[PDB]
Amino acid sequence: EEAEWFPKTSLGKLVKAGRITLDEIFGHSLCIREPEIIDYFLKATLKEEVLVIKSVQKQTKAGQKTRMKVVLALGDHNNYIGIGSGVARDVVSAINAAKVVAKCSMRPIKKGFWGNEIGEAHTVPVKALGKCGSVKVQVTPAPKGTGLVAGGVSKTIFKLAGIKDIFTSSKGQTCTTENFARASLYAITNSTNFNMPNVIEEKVVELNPILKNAEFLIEQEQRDLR
Amino acid sequence: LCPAIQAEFIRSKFEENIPYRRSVVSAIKNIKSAGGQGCVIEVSGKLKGQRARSVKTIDGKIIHAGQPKEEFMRYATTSVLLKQGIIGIKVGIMLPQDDEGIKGPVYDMVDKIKVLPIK
Amino acid sequence: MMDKLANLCITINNANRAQKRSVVIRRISKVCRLFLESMQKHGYITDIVYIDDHREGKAVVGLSGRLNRCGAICPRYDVELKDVERYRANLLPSRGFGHLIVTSSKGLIDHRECIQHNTGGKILGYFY
Amino acid sequence: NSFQRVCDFSLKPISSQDRSSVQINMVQLDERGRATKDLMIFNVSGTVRKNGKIDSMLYERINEM
Amino acid sequence: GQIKGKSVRTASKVIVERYFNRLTNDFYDNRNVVIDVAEIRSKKLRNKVSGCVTKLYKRVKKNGVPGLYIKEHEEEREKKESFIPKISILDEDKVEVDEVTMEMINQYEINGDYVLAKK
Amino acid sequence: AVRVVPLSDKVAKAMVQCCCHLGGVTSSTSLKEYIFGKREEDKVNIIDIKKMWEKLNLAARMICSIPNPKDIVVVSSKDFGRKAVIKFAESIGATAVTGRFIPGSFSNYEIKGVREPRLVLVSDCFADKQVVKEASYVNAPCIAFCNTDNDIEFVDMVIPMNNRSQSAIGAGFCILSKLVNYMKGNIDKVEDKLRDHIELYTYRDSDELEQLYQEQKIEE
Amino acid sequence: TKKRSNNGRSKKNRGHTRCVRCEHCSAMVPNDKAIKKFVVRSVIDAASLDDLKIATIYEEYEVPKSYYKLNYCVSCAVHIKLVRVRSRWERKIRKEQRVSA
RNA sequence: UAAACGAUGCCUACGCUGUUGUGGUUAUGAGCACGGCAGAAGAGAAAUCUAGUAGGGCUUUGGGGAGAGUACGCGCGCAA
Numbered sequence A: 001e002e003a004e005w006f007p008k009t010s011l012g013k014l015v016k017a018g019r020i021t022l023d024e025i026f027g028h029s030l031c032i033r034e035p036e037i038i039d040y041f042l043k044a045t046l047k048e049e050v051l052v053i054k055s056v057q058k059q060t061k062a063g064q065k066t067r068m069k070v071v072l073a074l075g076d077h078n079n080y081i082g083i084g085s086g087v088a089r090d091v092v093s094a095i096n097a098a099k100v101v102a103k104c105s106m107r108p109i110k111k112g113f114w115g116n117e118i119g120e121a122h123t124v125p126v127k128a129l130g131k132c133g134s135v136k137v138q139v140t141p142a143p144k145g146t147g148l149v150a151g152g153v154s155k156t157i158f159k160l161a162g163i164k165d166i167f168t169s170s171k172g173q174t175c176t177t178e179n180f181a182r183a184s185l186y187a188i189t190n191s192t193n194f195n196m197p198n199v200i201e202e203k204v205v206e207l208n209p210i211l212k213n214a215e216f217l218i219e220q221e222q223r224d225l226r
Numbered sequence B: 001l002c003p004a005i006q007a008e009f010i011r012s013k014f015e016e017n018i019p020y021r022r023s024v025v026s027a028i029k030n031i032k033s034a035g036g037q038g039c040v041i042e043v044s045g046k047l048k049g050q051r052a053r054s055v056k057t058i059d060g061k062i063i064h065a066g067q068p069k070e071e072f073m074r075y076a077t078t079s080v081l082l083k084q085g086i087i088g089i090k091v092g093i094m095l096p097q098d099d100e101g102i103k104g105p106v107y108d109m110v111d112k113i114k115v116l117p118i119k
Numbered sequence C: 001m002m003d004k005l006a007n008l009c010i011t012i013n014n015a016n017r018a019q020k021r022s023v024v025i026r027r028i029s030k031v032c033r034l035f036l037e038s039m040q041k042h043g044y045i046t047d048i049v050y051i052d053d054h055r056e057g058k059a060v061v062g063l064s065g066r067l068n069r070c071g072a073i074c075p076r077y078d079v080e081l082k083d084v085e086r087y088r089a090n091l092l093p094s095r096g097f098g099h100l101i102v103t104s105s106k107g108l109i110d111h112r113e114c115i116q117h118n119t120g121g122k123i124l125g126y127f128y
Numbered sequence D: 001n002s003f004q005r006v007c008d009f010s011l012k013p014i015s016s017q018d019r020s021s022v023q024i025n026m027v028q029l030d031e032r033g034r035a036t037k038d039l040m041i042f043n044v045s046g047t048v049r050k051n052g053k054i055d056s057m058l059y060e061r062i063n064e065m
Numbered sequence E: 001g002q003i004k005g006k007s008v009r010t011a012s013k014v015i016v017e018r019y020f021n022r023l024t025n026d027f028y029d030n031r032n033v034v035i036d037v038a039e040i041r042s043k044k045l046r047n048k049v050s051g052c053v054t055k056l057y058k059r060v061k062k063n064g065v066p067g068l069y070i071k072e073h074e075e076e077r078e079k080k081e082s083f084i085p086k087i088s089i090l091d092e093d094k095v096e097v098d099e100v101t102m103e104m105i106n107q108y109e110i111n112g113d114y115v116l117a118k119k
Numbered sequence F: 001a002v003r004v005v006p007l008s009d010k011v012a013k014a015m016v017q018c019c020c021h022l023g024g025v026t027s028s029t030s031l032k033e034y035i036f037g038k039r040e041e042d043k044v045n046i047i048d049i050k051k052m053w054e055k056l057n058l059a060a061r062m063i064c065s066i067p068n069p070k071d072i073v074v075v076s077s078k079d080f081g082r083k084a085v086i087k088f089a090e091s092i093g094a095t096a097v098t099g100r101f102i103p104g105s106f107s108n109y110e111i112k113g114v115r116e117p118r119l120v121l122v123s124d125c126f127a128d129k130q131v132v133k134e135a136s137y138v139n140a141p142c143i144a145f146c147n148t149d150n151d152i153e154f155v156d157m158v159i160p161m162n163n164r165s166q167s168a169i170g171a172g173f174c175i176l177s178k179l180v181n182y183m184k185g186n187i188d189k190v191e192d193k194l195r196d197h198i199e200l201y202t203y204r205d206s207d208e209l210e211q212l213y214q215e216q217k218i219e220e
Numbered sequence G: 001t002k003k004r005s006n007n008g009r010s011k012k013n014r015g016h017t018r019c020v021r022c023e024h025c026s027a028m029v030p031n032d033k034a035i036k037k038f039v040v041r042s043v044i045d046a047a048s049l050d051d052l053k054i055a056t057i058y059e060e061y062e063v064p065k066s067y068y069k070l071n072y073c074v075s076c077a078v079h080i081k082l083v084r085v086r087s088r089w090e091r092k093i094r095k096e097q098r099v100s101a
Numbered sequence H: 001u002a003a004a005c006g007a008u009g010c011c012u013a014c015g016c017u018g019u020u021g022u023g024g025u026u027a028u029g030a031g032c033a034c035g036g037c038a039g040a041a042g043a044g045a046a047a048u049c050u051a052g053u054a055g056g057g058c059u060u061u062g063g064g065g066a067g068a069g070u071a072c073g074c075g076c077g078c079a080a
């Protein structure tokens, strides 16, 4: 038993029709607002890991009302990672909720070389910093074959993102698992967007694919109607 | 759809010394899967210590007020004896609508309005 | 009074953050000229004009899209050629790009030229 | 690939997560002032948009052209 | 308090949009139509629905109720619009206007029978 | 210079009668570039005609760039300026919204009946603030008519014009409609149909329409 | 925590100000902090003006008024209900009150 | 000796807009010194912002609660 997907959004129409690729999506900074879009391309490959489960409470006249809060990561060990939190009356329901958030916040992560460009890229390109609440994390590139010098939570995140060597430092109240997870994901993300000296010349330009395919979509408009 | 059966499934599991939570969750699944549009379960007594409490669970639709309660709602109550005292169990189930009148009422609730589609 | 080489750096850093393309810098010294001329050689800034106002001096400069950050170090520490890589690893983001500038008997030079010429000096500033 | 989008007004990359980024498309005028099949295309970041600065900047660049 | 309640106003609003041409200024016609089209299981409810529908029909036929689109009165409003105004700014080709506007007319060399505002 | 469809004398006259050029008293650093002097008697700022024509041409150009015109969404949440939108959109093939813009209606799938935009048009954008705010979530450009008192963050094309008078609203919408049609070759000259259309768009009270009905019927 | 940006008083760019005394309890309060109230009251009540019209010897007469400025300390102003407690967003609204009679 | 408090050291920088004051000067367009207010962007655990950006210079000063700003010695004061 399963339910077929009817795309709620305009971009959703293009993916189901098979007119687009996942790099084109990320490349044009298009919104993702249907989890099925990520399933379509990566369902066969996604792994996940639960970082924390915790119980939260609200005081009432009758007593404490209580809920389960779960935070997890989705990633593929190659290029993609996303982080998601959910709250529900039940630990199962909470996982279902968290997965939606994670999928709607996947990002591609760039890689580079510690020295010369021999072999395959293996570390973050550039030294960078990520901040969330009271927590700050800094990442530094590392020689090939050092492995992941990283703390408990952040180590899992680098692994899912497909990074092989790193050096890490940290400041603040790292016991707060949500802050430590978000800050480390920002650190790698910030490193990918650093304004490298080559970047200005590597630049390319194209028309947005939703404008490019307007003719087909106008046919689909009439097909749905007729 | 019989609350008197489900309550005895519950009473059994207490004597089998199984947690009330797991027992109740199973009961609600059985009631819903069999087609009941909702149900209520309450357990009361010396359930987790010397201080007595009651724990109540609600799922789907349940009617409390008026004549629609007498035709859609079914109830059962039982109790189990344990070394520390008596634990009481209440179960209520709301029957599905049924056009042949076997599983529940033929006519749906008096306050529901439905407007026909146009040709 | 503020240090002139510090003033230079904050003026361009803030204007870059505010997405301006050009600035006027209000107090200039001999090493400030040489610092700006270094950033031009490596293509971090594009155009330089100097105004001879008889009141100290001032400069007008065009910024490139390549400049992320620059800064001065105070005080100007003395370094042996053995020491410079320690400062390189502390200041710069990557082993692949960016410049650490050092004053020497051969003018201003970067951390690569130090190896070529076989000379330490005094640490001055950095940009990437 | 996933890492080749750059903002035209602020000369830095646009991250995949930025909900406020947008792409602007415009036609080109024909002889005798009518329309054509060719398009101008601009990629603009969210940072300029939260400030309000995009209004003037676009007017500048249409003049540059 | 004689307020109609949510299902009664909702069914009223839907029926007037779904069957508008079938309805009239008469309570008994409107009661016949709701007896004909609707599922409503007590005369107590359909007396109240037809009451609200004949309360709307006056206001709706009297130049419309905002929040209640009727195609028959979209057409009536198109007829009222097709009754086009014969007023004109179009013949006001002679004009007087302030100096700043006269200099804008000069700087863009705009031809026409303009005058400085005599004021 | 910018390549713009030529001004023609009757069109110029038309806008001046419609009182397009009368700004307010206040001004904003964003809008200084469009003003050309101030009325000594009234402290009212006067708008530059040549610039008004330029940005009107620029708007028209980009309206032509988007296929399937239904994906253009025109909004104007006020009477005194209502009917203009209702006709204007039909002259180009766009969709429209008329009443209160239900907040979340671009964001949220569950609210029915409004399409995902690819270009949003707004008149008198002190109201319809929500529309400008919400389009920002879905990567759409925005075009607005605006006046010297008011200023906006996310509007890409600000067409300068009086927006506080029923004479004025008609003029902007009527002219722009024609340009878009012209740029595509649907019409051969712009002066063709001035007093007909510009009147059709212009707002009128029920009380006027009673009088006009009675007049018309007497003439019939 | 700091409840008001102006510390509950109108002093700025000064060291020290004159004190005044509360009408209701004679407590000292700084002039820039005291709650102020203005009064313009007829010497003769409204319920007597219709008798005044037959009592007076003059062809017409204008009743004399009496004028006052009153000062109150915080405790008295709250207790006499010249001012009331207000919500965190209302606290910021400033508007001139009516002159009493 | 004070809740001697805007509980925010002194010089010197770089920095968005609107509005309202006080004193001089004015191509009447504006400035210079000293202020108040309202947003924004950044910042911060938040409340909020004398708190934005930063290896500029120099002095004071804190290092879990208590015992304790107390004991002994010393310097000032008629004493307190």
Ligand SMILES: [Zn+2]
Residues within 6 Å of the ligand: G022, G023, G024, G025, G026, G027, G072, G073, G075, G076
């Ligand atoms: Zn008192």
